[PDB]
């Protein structure tokens, strides 16, 4: 315990690669190039403690559902068990996104290169969660219609692969003057609108919100935007600098919202499965 001893430092003495939020004035971990010191810091208080734990807790719970739901006892309750792949893809995305997020935050203070590597993973993780969310959702909403479903899926994956590849850029390019990573990110959010409305027109507006729960499900899209808008704005830190150094920062609320939103997606999505069994087609 007398190894890798460290103390919290103010924002001013931080290196540029650790300077990512000027509204967090104190409680920053000093750069420590040790994974042992980085993982041991999880059980200590600093600017990133909240971010670690929120997605660390989110990971375990989403991990349970993935495995618990995957070992469904009522395999008989599932028709035709082909459906497990659809749910599984979602869980991988949620689990990977969640695992990458807590890892990046923990190893954030290690070194500039390590921070860079894990940062790319965090970005890739978000794209995976979005990709994962669509497969279960698209499958059931277009359960009756195979041709529209296959087509919607290809777009998301192409846009999704594009997102991960653009963000990681391990193979080629960046950093660049170009803001194209944003274009691919734009693809993910936007691709969702064509399917969602398509579902409403085909099933009717009234039936889709009430039964499809799309309107009730509308909250999730709102939540993600709230989180995205909130994090960029950096509220409430912007309004009260130095008052949100350790708790209730924008990033942790955003981190919390991702779990709440992914869960809401799951509850809403599960209801869609019940809708499908009732009606073969119409």
């Amino acid at each position: 315990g007398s190894e890798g001893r460290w103390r919290v430092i103010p924002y001013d003495v931080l290196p540029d690669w650790l300077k990512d939020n000027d509204y967090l004035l104190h409680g920053h971990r000093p750069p420590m190039p040790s994974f042992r010191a980085c993982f041991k810091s999880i059980f200590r208080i600093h600017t990133e403690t909240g971010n670690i734990w929120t997605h660390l807790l989110g990971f375990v719970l989403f991990l349970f559902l993935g495995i618990l739901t995957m070992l469904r006892p009522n395999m008989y309750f599932m028709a035709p068990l082909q459906e497990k792949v659809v749910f599984g893809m979602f869980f991988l995305g949620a689990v990977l996104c969640l695992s990458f997020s807590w890892l990046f935050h923990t190893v954030y203070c290690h070194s500039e290169k390590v921070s860079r590597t894990f940062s790319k993973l965090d970005y890739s993780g978000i794209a995976l969660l979005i990709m994962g969310s669509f497969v279960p959702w698209l499958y059931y909403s277009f359960y009756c219609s195979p041709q529209p479903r296959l087509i919607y899926l290809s777009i998301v994956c192409v846009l999704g692969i594009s997102a991960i590849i653009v963000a990681q850029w391990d193979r080629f390019a960046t950093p660049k003057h170009r803001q194209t990573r944003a274009g691919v990110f734009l693809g993910l959010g936007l691709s969702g609108v064509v399917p969602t409305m398509h579902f409403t027109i085909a099933e009717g507006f009234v039936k889709a919100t009430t039964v499809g729960q799309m309107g009730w499900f509308f909250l999730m899209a709102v939540m993600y935007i709230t989180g995205a808008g909130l994090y960029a704005a950096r509220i409430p830190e912007r309004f009260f600098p130095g008052k949100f150094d350790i708790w209730f920062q924008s990033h942790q609320i955003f981190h919390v919202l991702v779990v709440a939103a992914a869960f809401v997606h799951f509850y809403g999505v599960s209801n869609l499965q019940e809708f499908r069994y009732g009606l073969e087609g119409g």
Partner: antibody, heavy 118, light 107 residues
Framework: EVLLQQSGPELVKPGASVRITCKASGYTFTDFNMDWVKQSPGKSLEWIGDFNPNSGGSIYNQKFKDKATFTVDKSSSTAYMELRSLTFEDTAVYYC???????????WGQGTLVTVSA | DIQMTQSPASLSASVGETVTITCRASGNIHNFLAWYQQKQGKSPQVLVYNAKTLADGVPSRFSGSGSGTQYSLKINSLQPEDFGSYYCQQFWSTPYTFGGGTKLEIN
């Protein structure tokens, strides 16, 4: 910028005790730990130990356990080190070094020369 | 207590030449190492910290490399003011220790 200022040269008799002063300016004094270093003439640096302004908690090298005691004045933003039962072996230049989260010293005092003569 | 062994005891080079100073630790110090330069009769100044991080305001000629028990300080395009004593220290474990030091001469 950050400045660490030390007291003047000290000439003392064996068995005497001396106090070294480190004056810290240009930064929040309580923000970082303060360390003390001893360099015997024509010799390498030795780590006496560290002191925490915030916790008033200090660690000493086994070699300097009884020899040195660290005290601090928060109002004056000044750190002190006390050397007792001075011996011949203690004739060295003494520095105060400020760490930055980890014990790497960006800032150093000019140093204090403690000369012990019979 | 970690023991820091510095190599060599002393060395010399001409202006513009490259010199490498090596430091070896008794145990793994996990990249918690710093390099200092001390001019005669003056307090030491930090060059590199955290094994490979250059301190602010330090000339680009100074660089750090290594992991575990072995670390190196490399000086490119040697300068007249670079003469002095160079030290390495480990802040990974208590008590914090310093290398014997390396004396540098410029021709």
């Amino acid at each position: 910028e950050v400045l660490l200022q030390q007291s003047g040269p000290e000439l003392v008799k064996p068995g005497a005790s001396v106090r070294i002063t480190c004056k810290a300016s240009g930064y929040t004094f309580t923000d970082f730990n303060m360390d003390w270093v001893k360099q015997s003439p024509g010799k390498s640096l030795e780590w006496i130990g560290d002191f925490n302004p915030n916790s008033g908690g200090s660690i000493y090298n086994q070699k300097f356990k009884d020899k040195a005691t660290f005290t601090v004045d928060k109002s004056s933003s000044t750190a002190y080190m006390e050397l007792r039962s001075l011996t011949f072996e203690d004739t060295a230049v003494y520095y105060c070094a400020r760490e930055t989260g980890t014990a790497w010293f960006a800032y150093w005092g000019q140093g204090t020369l403690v000369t012990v003569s019979a | 207590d970690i023991q820091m062994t510095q190599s060599p005891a002393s060395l010399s080079a001409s202006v513009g030449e490259t010199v490498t100073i090596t430091c070896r630790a008794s145990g793994n110090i996990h990249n918690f190492l710093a390099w200092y330069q001390q001019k005669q009769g003056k307090s030491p100044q930090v060059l590199v910290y955290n094994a490979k991080t250059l301190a602010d305001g330090v000339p680009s000629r100074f660089s750090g490399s290594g992991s575990g028990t072995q670390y190196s300080l490399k000086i490119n395009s040697l300068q007249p003011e670079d003469f002095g004593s160079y030290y390495c220290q480990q802040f990974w474990s208590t008590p914090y220790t310093f290398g014997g030091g390396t004396k540098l001469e410029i021709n």
